[PDB]
Design a protein around this ligand. Structure first.
Ligand SMILES: CCCCCCCCCCCCCCCCCC(=O)OC[C@H](COP(=O)([O-])OCC(O)COP(=O)([O-])OC[C@@H](COC(=O)CCCCCCCCCCCCCCCCC)OC(=O)CCCCCCCCCCCCCCCCC)OC(=O)CCCCCCCCCCCCCCCCC
Ligand code: BCL
Ligand SMILES: CC[C@H]1c2cc3[nH]c4c(c3C)C(=O)[C@H](C(=O)OC)c4c3nc(cc4[nH]c(cc(n2)[C@@H]1C)c(C(C)=O)c4C)[C@@H](C)[C@@H]3CCC(=O)OC/C=C(\C)CCC[C@H](C)CCC[C@H](C)CCCC(C)C
Ligand SMILES: CCCCCCCCCCCCCCCCCC(=O)OC[C@H](COP(=O)([O-])OCC[N+](C)(C)C)OC(=O)CCCCCCCCCCCCCCCCC
Ligand SMILES: CCCCCCCCCCCCCCCCCC(=O)OC[C@H](COP(=O)([O-])OCC[N+](C)(C)C)OC(=O)CCCCCCCCCCCCCCCCC
Ligand SMILES: CCCCCCCCCCCCCCCCCC(=O)OC[C@H](COP(=O)([O-])OCC[N+](C)(C)C)OC(=O)CCCCCCCCCCCCCCCCC
Ligand SMILES: COC(C)(C)C/C=C/C(C)=C/C=C/C(C)=C/C=C/C(C)=C/C=C/C=C(C)/C=C/C=C(\C)CC/C=C(\C)CCC=C(C)C
Ligand SMILES: COC(C)(C)C/C=C/C(C)=C/C=C/C(C)=C/C=C/C(C)=C/C=C/C=C(C)/C=C/C=C(\C)CC/C=C(\C)CCC=C(C)C
Ligand SMILES: COC(C)(C)C/C=C/C(C)=C/C=C/C(C)=C/C=C/C(C)=C/C=C/C=C(C)/C=C/C=C(\C)CC/C=C(\C)CCC=C(C)C
Ligand SMILES: COC(C)(C)C/C=C/C(C)=C/C=C/C(C)=C/C=C/C(C)=C/C=C/C=C(C)/C=C/C=C(\C)CC/C=C(\C)CCC=C(C)C
Ligand SMILES: COC(C)(C)C/C=C/C(C)=C/C=C/C(C)=C/C=C/C(C)=C/C=C\C=C(C)\C=C\C=C(/C)CC/C=C(\C)CCC=C(C)C
Ligand SMILES: [Fe+2]
Lengths: 44, 307, 260, 55, 68, 281, 48, 44, 55, 44, 55, 44, 54, 43
């Protein structure tokens, strides 16, 4: 109920769902790139 | 782009400003000189009037004689050839007496005596100019801050030319007259005393010279930024704090956590500039008399890697 | 005295450097206390004195005897805004901006702020008014540069808001301070010379849009301007930079607002 | 420890969160650079030596 | 602010519009950072090209500082 | 935590990036987006200087030195213990300086003042980048930049200067030195003059700008004015930094010999080169 | 992680997104530069 | 009772609970990473 | 100890908490760097010598 | 009742109690860390 | 000796007390550093030599 | 009674009495320390 | 000599006292350091030689 | 003349106190010098 930004709870929930979807997509792309690099040249 | 107030975009010219008459003897003040449009684009266009007092006359005569003595020595070194004089103008030098003569005034005229004559003229000229600054402040009822800042500059100058040669017991330690010659004196002074960079007082002098450049950049930039509020009229801001002084103070408070006042910034300015020559004179006075090699001194004081 | 040490490596050079460190600490203390003569004691965002006042204490007060019988000024001393501030707290916690309650340019808050100074003209050394219109200044005339008198004045919205009628000059400094601009309604406002760009054909005022020229505070006397009026005019014009931004027709601003 | 929530009665969450983000990223970068500087735990050099990449 | 005439992009569901707006904000920030970084890289490249044109390799200074 | 007049100036707006996300103050400091960036870069640089002190093996602050990569590494990266730390600290320093300038831009926009202060700071940033980035890149090695030590960057200055004989003979160096000396002289004069006007002889009224102009006209026959003196101070400092950057950017890139050898061109002009006598004859 | 969405009621969304894009690009550049620093993984060191 | 941020006790408790949830998630990921590094290359 | 709470009557909790956080972080970093400087207690180098990583 | 900061006596007491709880938790963690280090590698 | 209290009619007690504290601390530090600097009276070196710490 | 500071005569006397008590305490501690050092290592 | 008190009607006693204190302390430190510099009168070195500390 | 503004009696009292302090300081200095000269004369 703090509302420093004027967003309601439902708006915050929807925006966070969109943001987390994007975050997981970006993380999956990064994981794919890391798998490619690790196969090409592992660092462990 | 917007107007940055670096150059005036229009000039207005009125009657020549004859100046205040607090206690100044108006007889000794000259007439107003020409108005310079070129100077008006940047500051005031008015030239003069200048005050020609007793100390002013003494200083002008002594400085003219010093300059003329150096010039006649340069003409002698040129073989009286104007082409040679122009070719080697920066390479001519009026060197002090050789070390064999110590502090004695028995050095021959072409081997150090003329340097002593020119140095006497410069000494009288500079000290009479200091008295002139003091008395010009006194005649207007102003404080003697200019006199004391000039005294700091004179302290460095006296250490270079008079005090340190006396403490070292030789006029050869003093600075030759000439452009490249005194540059070479600076370089050789650093080399002889072992990398003057490791003089802590030379380091402080450089710190305050850099601080002077930094502080004048900051202050000029601040006043030009707040000049849209009449911030250039600083005495008014001291007497009646306007929005210009407040905006300058708040800019610097929000930038670096602390600020000055419209008057206190000028205390910062005068002290930052004074400490340059103060620490410089102390550092030059210590060189040779107390420390003969500054790199070894820095090694013994944890400023250099070895030892 | 080369190599003469009182103890350890401490010699005359070490003595000098440590004594200078002491002197520099003392000088920094003195300079900061001198700087603490305005804006102190510190206040909270509501107005009450703050618990924290800083390591440096206030200096003992000093008195300036103002010229021309304008009284005295003792600093540090009790100083207040002496004007209502039309700002509202945007957060209970300190350290956050205060939002203007109404029109900030009219309210005189933010970049459009002004200080309640003396409502008297600034005087020169002789006691006369420092800033005077060039018509009332004896012998003053434009000496170089483009003469702005007669040129149209264009606002930040690229619309003409008046014409320059007169130049207000600082008699001692002999430099232009204010351009007097006649608006469409026949009344005249003042514009600081530092906020106007005198071009070949027009005088461009990037700070204010045309419609804001009427809102510039006016001078109660056509021949003199007081410090308070100067502060109000300068504050209004400068606050126009941040508060007339929507009306400003900058191309870069338009492109940035396209993607923002 | 049950009353630690009162830290938010003193500090506004906006400034605290900004400061904490800066501090945490700074600390992580510092520790990673400390590990990279040492010949041990420089995982890039460890892998280079393991797979004979550096001559 | 003026209405677009194309009107075909309006057929997207508003949640995809929200996702596009979030991606656009992130891409705007990243693009400004990338512009700064590539401008710095181009400044370095310009100075490197100038240094290549100049006869630095023919006569180059020794090491100003002890290697470390 | 606020000055007696600060309240009416703390308003939203003026930010370049972030809107109201970082539009707040921490004590007196205005943070902003670039303030967050500046603090991060500054803390990282300071902590890395401390860590480089750890690696070097000395805790004496005057002996702490972060040397750039050796000339063998060229313009590429280097191991952190032997030059990579210097590169990271240089990147952090450049980021901190640029963020400081942009934070000053934000503060200027908030206060409605001109951008003279960040613009003047940009000159110092450009001189720093000349010494650490532009000149080493032109010369092709990071080892031509100076170490981050209190007394070792003085060693860098000394070695770089004596590489070209007496560095006093660099003409751009001469111009920069004359600008620096003139700036210090003008700063002393300006501070002294304003203080003398504002603190006259005891019991006398405060002076006016007319008194200052009268004093300097009676002294040297000319007075530049308050606006004039502040313009002059800004221009002297900026010109000093510009000409020092120029002197270092031409040294080792288009000039390689002793600088007195440069000054020989005036001596060897056709119409007086062969005339006997003088110094160079 | 159920109530992390409330962080968008503390910080403005678009501002955080712009700042986060800047941060992600700068972090990517930093990691690439650190990789270029090491002799291994220095993919721009194509040699004979 | 004490007021410096405008948050009530309930709002402060909710904010602190969410913050502690984030802190414990971050600490759990850090502990997993530390276990992985210690298994890969112990430092004690 | 009984009346030490009155320190908060003198010192603002926000100022003191910020100062204490900065002080504690700087002190902890200082002590860790002191330990890392000494060849003993440099736990990274100790582990490297213990498991013979440097080979 | 000096009240430089405006806190009342009850507010100061509650704040100090919570602060000392935090300080004692921090001190206990530090003591455990020191015991671990002293066991692993004593400095006396 | 009896009228010395009148010095407080001349000197502001706060300024005198601050200056005296600074002066006494600087003087004590200077004397201690003089004693440490001299090879004799350096009580740390004396203790080391007495109990053969340097070995 | 020049009154450069505004203190009255009685205030000055009381302040000087307290100051002299502090000074004598400091001097007594210094004298004891000097006796201890001179016994431990005389400098004459 | 009996009328030396009139010097306080020409000199501000506060400034005179401050200047005198600063001058006396600086002079005392200068003399003590000069004595320390000379190998004789360096009471620390004299004590070291007398009691065979070195 | 009255540059300071002090009354004559105030100046005389201040001088008496100052001379008491000066005599105490100089007496301690004389004792110290006598002790040093006995310990190590400089003539
Ligand atoms: C070797 C040294 C060689 C020296 C060569 C000569 C160099 C001269 C330099 C002078 C610069 C003067 C600049 C100036 O204008 O002053 C403005 C300013 C003028 O005041 P004002 O309010 O405007 O006067 C109003 C009058 O109506 C109107 O004022 P006025 O017109 O009458 O004049 C202003 C006043 C100003 O002059 C001064 O105040 C001089 C102050 C001392 C300057 C000398 C410093 C030396 C430093 C050496 C350090 C050791 C190195 C070894 O002038 C004087 O009163 C006499 C000055 C004569 C100079 C003689 C120098 C010898 O000067 C001051 O009065 C304030 C100065 C404050 C200095 C504080 C230093 C602190 C001392 C140590 C404290 C220890 C604390 C311990 C803490 C440690 C913690 C770790
Ligand atoms: C190889 C050369 C040596 C070296 C050797 C020296 C020596 C030697 C000296 C300095 C000094 C100085 N050096 Mg160094 N210096 C070196 C490297 C540096 C570097 C650098 C980046 O490398 C810097 C920034 C500096 C900076 C400085 C200044 C801080 C300082 C001079 C202050 C000043 O204004 O003097 C110039 C100002 C004056 C001399 C005062 C003049 C005042 C008088 C009254 C003027 C009279 C004018 C006359 C009448 C003419 C009138 C003309 C008419 C009006 C027309 N040095 C190296 C290590 N340097 C000086 C100093 O103080 O060192 C501690 C000094 O003596
Ligand atoms: C705080 C230290 C800085 C400083 C201060 C300073 N110099 C000063 C002053 C002050 C405060 C003066 O009041 C005084 C002055 O009048 O300035 C306008 C002066 C001055 N500083 C001067 C020069 C000068 N200052 C220098 C340096 C500096 N001065 C320091 C950086 C330098 C150098 C080498 O860096 C020079 C060349 C003069 C313009 C002037 C002193 C004039 C003088 O003494 O003239 C007598 C000599 C002649 C008249 C010869 C004339 C020869 C022919 C007729 C022409
Ligand atoms: C305005 C301030 C401008 C500062 C720039 C000027 C620098 C001059 C310093 C002179 C120091 C000196 O002379 O040393 C000998 C003098 C006296 O010699 P000393 O021997 O007694 O002290 C040195 C101590 N040992 C030997 C252990 C190294 O030392 C000092 O006065 C103390 C100076 C300490 C400076 C510390 C700087 C720390 C800054 C952070 C470092 C980050 C990297
Ligand atoms: C390792 C590096 C440590 C950095 C921090 C040191 C803090 C030392 C303890 C400060 C303290 O007790 O007061 C807290 C205070 C908090 O109190 P405050 O900020 O509320 O002060 C209120 C203002 N007074 C009381 C003066 C009216 O923090 C500081 O002011 C810290 C000052 C640090 C000075 C750094 C060295 C300068 C030389
Ligand atoms: C003469 C010229 C000397 C130049 C060398 C000294 C420059 C540094 C000045 C430091 C300073 O003023 O500290 C004040 C400030 C104190 O800032 P503050 O945060 O405590 O606020 C101002 C203090 N009151 C309110 C008491 C005025 O120091 C700093 O903020 C950090 C400076 C780091 C250097
Ligand atoms: C010196 O240290 C080194 C460099 C060596 C090591 C570095 C260490 C450190 C400290 C690293 C720091 C790491 C951190 C803190 C990383 C943080 C990463 C985070 C939180 C990233 C978040 C990313 C979020 C993104 C990109 C969200 C994007 C959202 C959108 C684009 C909107 C949604 C749109 C979608 C899903 C498009 C869907 C489209 C299709 C076709 C399905
Ligand atoms: C040189 O020394 C070295 C570096 C070698 C050793 C290092 C030493 C030091 C000094 C180490 C320092 C350690 C410290 C002090 C670490 C501190 C760690 C902490 C305290 C971490 C905290 C993490 C918390 C996190 C990640 C919390 C995240 C929270 C969220 C993602 C959710 C936020 C959203 C909220 C609260 C919504 C609330 C809103 C409403 C409307 C209720
Ligand atoms: C060079 O010297 C070396 C490094 C070798 C040796 C070091 C020497 C020195 C000088 C070491 C210094 C040691 C010192 C002075 C350490 C001091 C440590 C202290 C005092 C630490 C304090 C820690 C306190 C903490 C972590 C407290 C945390 C509190 C909370 C988390 C709760 C806060 C919430 C509150 C108060 C709620 C407010 C209440 C209401 C009702 C609104
Ligand atoms: C290089 O030279 C070396 C260092 C080798 C030799 C040194 C030579 C020199 C020059 C040595 C100099 C020695 C001097 C001048 C020493 C002076 C010492 C003095 C005068 C010390 C005074 C100490 C006084 C103290 C500690 C007094 C403390 C008092 C209090 C804590 C209580 C104050 C409270 C009051 C007055 C309450 C307020 C009163 C009322 C009525 C409200
Ligand atoms: C072509 O047209 C003519 C010939 C008419 C005029 C031309 C003049 C020319 C070409 C002038 C050239 C002047 C130049 C190049 C001057 C250069 C001056 C420089 C660079 C000076 C640098 C440093 C000087 C210093 C530090 C001087 C210090 C001097 C003192 C501190 C005074 C010493 C006083 C002494 C020795 C008094 C001894 C005498 C007695 C009676 C006790
Ligand atoms: Fe100024």
């Amino acid at each position: 109920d703090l509302g420093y930004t004027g967003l309601t709870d439902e708006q915050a929930q929807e925006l966070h769902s969109v943001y987390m979807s994007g975050l997981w997509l970006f993380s999956a792309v990064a994981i794919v790139a890391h798998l490619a690099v690790y196969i090409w040249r592992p660092w462990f | 782009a917007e107007y940055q107030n670096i150059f005036s975009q229009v000039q207005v010219r009125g009657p020549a400003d004859l100046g205040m008459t607090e206690d100044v003897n108006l007889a000794n003040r000259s007439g107003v000189g020409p108005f310079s449009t070129l100077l008006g684009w940047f500051g005031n266009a008015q030239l003069g009037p200048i005050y020609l007092g007793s100390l002013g006359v003494l200083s002008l005569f002594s400085g003219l004689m010093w300059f003329f003595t150096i010039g006649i020595w340069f003409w002698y070194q040129a073989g009286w050839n104007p082409a040679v004089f122009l070719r080697d103008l920066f390479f001519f030098s009026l060197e002090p007496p050789a070390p064999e003569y110590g502090l004695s005034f028995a050095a021959p005229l072409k081997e150090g005596g003329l340097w002593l004559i020119a140095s006497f003229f410069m000494f009288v000229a500079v000290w009479s100019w200091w008295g002139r600054t003091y008395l010009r402040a006194q005649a207007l009822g102003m404080g003697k801050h200019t006199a004391w800042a000039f005294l700091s500059a004179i302290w460095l100058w006296m250490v270079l030319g008079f005090i340190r040669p006396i403490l070292m017991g030789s006029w050869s330690e003093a600075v030759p007259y000439g452009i490249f010659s005194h540059l070479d004196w600076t370089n050789n002074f650093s080399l002889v005393h072992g990398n003057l960079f490791y003089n802590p007082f030379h380091g402080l002098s450089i710190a305050f010279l850099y601080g002077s450049a930094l502080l004048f950049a900051m202050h000029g930039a601040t006043i030009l930024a707040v000049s849209r509020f009449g911030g250039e009229r600083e005495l008014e801001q001291i007497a009646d704090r306007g929005t210009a002084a407040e905006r300058a103070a708040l800019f610097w408070r929000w930038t670096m956590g602390f600020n000055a006042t419209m008057e206190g910034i000028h205390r910062w300015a005068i002290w930052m500039a004074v400490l340059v020559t103060l620490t410089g004179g102390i550092g030059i006075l210590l060189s040779g008399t107390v420390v003969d090699n500054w790199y070894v001194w820095g090694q013994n004081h944890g400023m250099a890697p070895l030892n | 005295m080369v190599g003469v040490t009182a103890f350890g490596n401490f010699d005359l050079a070490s003595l000098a450097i440590y004594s200078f460190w002491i002197f520099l600490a003392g000088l920094i203390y003195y300079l900061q206390t001198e700087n603490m003569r305005e804006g102190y004691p510190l206040e909270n965002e509501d107005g009450t004195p703050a618990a924290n006042q800083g390591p440096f204490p206030l200096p003992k007060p000093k008195t300036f005897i103002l010229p021309h019988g304008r009284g005295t000024l003792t600093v540090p001393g009790p100083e207040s805004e002496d004007r209502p501030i039309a700002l509202a707290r945007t957060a209970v916690s300190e350290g956050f901006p205060h939002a203007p309650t109404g029109d900030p340019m009219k309210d005189g808050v933010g970049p459009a702020s002004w200080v309640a100074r003396r409502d008297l003209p600034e005087l020169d050394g002789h006691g006369h008014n420092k800033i005077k219109p060039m018509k009332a200044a004896a012998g003053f005339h434009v000496s170089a540069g483009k003469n702005p008198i007669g040129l149209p004045v264009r606002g930040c919205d690229l619309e003409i808001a008046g014409k320059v009628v007169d130049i207000w000059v600082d008699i001692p400094e002999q430099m232009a301070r204010f351009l007097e601009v006649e608006l469409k309604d026949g009344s005249t406002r003042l514009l600081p010379m530092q906020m106007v760009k005198v071009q070949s054909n027009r005088v461009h005022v990037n700070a204010l849009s045309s419609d804001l020229f009427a809102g510039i505070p006016t001078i109660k006397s056509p021949t003199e301007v007081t410090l308070l009026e100067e502060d109000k005019i300068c504050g209004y014009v400068a606050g126009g930079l941040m508060y007339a931004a929507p009306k400003r027709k900058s191309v870069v601003a338009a492109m940035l607002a396209e993607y923002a | 420890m049950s009353k630690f929530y009162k830290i938010w009665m003193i500090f506004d969450p906006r400034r605290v969160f900004v400061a904490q983000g800066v501090f945490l990223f700074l600390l992580a970068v510092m520790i990673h650079l400390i590990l990279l500087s040492t010949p041990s735990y420089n995982w890039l050099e460890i892998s280079a030596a393991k797979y004979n990449r550096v001559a | 602010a003026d209405k677009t005439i194309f009107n075909d992009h309006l057929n997207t569901n508003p949640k995809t519009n929200l996702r596009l707006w979030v991606a656009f904000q992130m891409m705007k920030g990243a693009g400004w950072a990338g512009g700064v970084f590539f401008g710095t890289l181009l400044l370095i490249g310009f100075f490197r090209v100038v240094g290549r044109m100049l006869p630095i390799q023919e006569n180059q200074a020794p090491a100003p500082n002890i290697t470390g | 935590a606020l000055l007696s007049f600060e309240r009416k100036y703390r308003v939203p707006g003026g930010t370049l990036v972030g809107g109201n996300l970082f539009d707040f103050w921490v004590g007196p400091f205005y943070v902003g987006f670039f303030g967050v960036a500046t603090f991060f870069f500054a803390a990282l640089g300071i902590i890395l200087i401390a860590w480089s002190a750890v690696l070097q093996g000395t805790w004496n602050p005057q002996l702490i030195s972060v040397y750039p990569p050796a000339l063998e590494y060229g313009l590429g990266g280097a191991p952190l213990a032997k030059g990579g730390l210097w590169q990271i600290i240089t990147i952090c320093a450049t980021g901190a300086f640029v963020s400081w300038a942009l934070r000053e831009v934000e503060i200027c926009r908030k206060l409605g003042i001109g951008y003279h202060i960040p613009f003047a700071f940009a000159f110092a940033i450009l001189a720093y980048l000349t010494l650490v980035l532009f000149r080493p890149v032109m010369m092709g090695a990071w080892g031509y930049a100076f170490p981050y030590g209190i007394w070792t960057h003085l060693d860098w200055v000394s070695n770089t200067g004596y590489t070209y004989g007496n560095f006093h003979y660099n003409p751009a160096h001469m111009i920069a030195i004359s600008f620096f000396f003139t700036n210090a002289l003008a700063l002393a004069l300006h501070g002294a003059l304003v203080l003398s006007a504002a603190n006259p002889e005891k019991g006398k009224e405060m002076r006016t700008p007319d008194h200052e102009d009268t004093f300097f006209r009676d002294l040297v026959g000319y007075s530049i004015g308050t606006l004039g003196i502040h313009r002059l101070g800004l221009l002297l400092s900026l010109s000093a930094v510009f000409f020092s950057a120029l002197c270092m950017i031409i040294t080792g890139t288009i000039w390689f010999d002793q600088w007195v050898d440069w000054w020989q061109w005036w001596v060897k002009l056709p119409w007086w080169a062969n005339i006997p006598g003088g110094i160079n004859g």
